[PDB]
């Protein structure tokens with residue numbers, strides 16, 4: 695079967711990390727949309743204009759609003775992309791056949807939206823040469839960040855080629871986890887987000903979202919399906935592109 699995959703990058707990244715995976719899925723017969731979220735990739739906004747993870751998710755929400763009645767998509771989110779999935783599923787659960795988490799945060803419905811991110815900062819507290827700044831938007835002080843190049847090299851793109859790591863140094867932008875805004879956000883609902891099928895893809899070779907955090911998330915909010923990819927790194931759509939496309943074909947053949 696063919697599905698329409700909507701690929702959702704992580705913060706400080708853009709549609710471009712999917713540049714290898716999107717032609718592979720299309721060569722399998724699938725339709726693929728690779729969005730730039732607010733102030734990400736070649737989106738015209740800067741991060742200081744964005745006051746929350748919900749506003750940051752506007753390109754995905756606008757995309758889902760434009761789907762004609764009865765068209766469903768499979769959302770695929772990498773790293774912080776799981777939070778954009780949770781936001782989208784609370785507005786458009788009928789339009790989501792399934793959600794695939796790719797070395798991604800897995801929000802739940804029993805704790806606050808920031809919960810999984812609070813646990814990530816405890817498991818991975820040293821972001822090496824990542825720099826931080828603050829800005830104010832709608833009376834809230836938000837901590838922005840720009841991922842350090844050594845963190846990019848060693849923890850995110852560990853096993854990627856120098857031409858893939860070069861794209862990350864050239865294209866990663868200032869972003870924000872909006873953690874303090876997520877902490878005071880209403881909880882993801884059981885009827886929207888809680889109702890969708892969740893497929894959890896990960897590698898125990900991930901150098902930022904370490905096995906303790908990912909195994910902690912699997913036990914915290916049980917996925918409908920778990921796939922463990924052997925080897926690769928945090929960017930499995932670059933180091934294990936073929937393997938991710940095979941898993942996504944299986945999800946397409948399972949969830950309607």
Ligand SMILES: OC(O)(C(F)(F)F)C(F)(F)F
Nearest residue numbers: 704705706773774850902
């Ligand atoms: O997903 C990241 O890019 C961040 F957005 F959380 F910073 C990470 F991989 F660096 F953690």
